[PDB]
Structure 1
């Protein structure tokens, strides 16, 4: 359930970031953002990796893509 709840948060972060870009479709000088995620796996000395699944999805960074925009 925690891995699924990690996926919902990761999918919600992407949706929030995309909504922010669309909301700022008109503001001058705005630079869009891209959400980047990373996996999770942590196995103890007492845990047998061969029988273990992963830890979910971890958000790595929300960038700040700085490519040139159109000019009005």
Structure 2
């Protein structure tokens, strides 16, 4: 009966993952999830093996498939998209660029201090380029003003 309960749990986990994927159909920059499972088997010291059935199914991991999604056009230049490999970097607080998180959506706007932030007013990390030389001198992240 526990094997059947494990099967029910795995099926409901896949159902929940699919429901989350469907619900996030409109979220910007969202990446879908995939449910992968694995077989279960005992490893007792004295195992008959030929006379021992399986032990059900165990959830292995919920994947985070990162294949490129489609792009919409809003004609708003403050909206940015990373085509290819790479993530945007945003910091919770302006004065602590060290504490940062990665994101993909580009719904940016200027706050009252003329800094580019996300919807949650999280500052967008940027570099500092040289006045004449195109190459960026310092690679430390800082908020863009």
TM class, shorter-length: over 0.9
Q: Greater helix share, 1 or 2?
A: 1
Shift of 1:3: 0.4
After superposition, the C-alpha distances for 1:1-23 in whole angstroms (9 at most, x for unaligned) are 00000000000000000000000
Number of residue pairs the alignment of both structures matches: 71
1:39 and 2:39 correspond: yes
Unaligned runs of 5+ in 1: none
TM-score normalised to structure 2 length: 0.48
Which structure has the higher relative contact order (CA within 8 Å, separation 6+)? 1
Q: Distance in 1 between matches of 2:49 and 2:64?
A: 37
Q: Greater strand share, 1 or 2?
A: 2
Q: Secondary structure at the match of 1:27?
A: coil
Q: Secondary structure at the match of 1:22?
A: helix
After superposition, the C-alpha distances for 1:39-70 in whole angstroms (9 at most, x for unaligned) are 00114223311111001001000010000000
Q: Secondary structure at the match of 1:50?
A: coil
Q: Secondary structure at the match of 1:38?
A: strand
TM-score normalised to structure 1 length: 0.93
Rg bigger for which structure?
A: 2
Give RMSD over aligned pairs. Answer: 0.9
Alignment of 1:19-58 (within 5 A): 19-58=19-58
Where does structure 1 differ by over 4 angstroms across 4 or more consecutive aligned residues? none
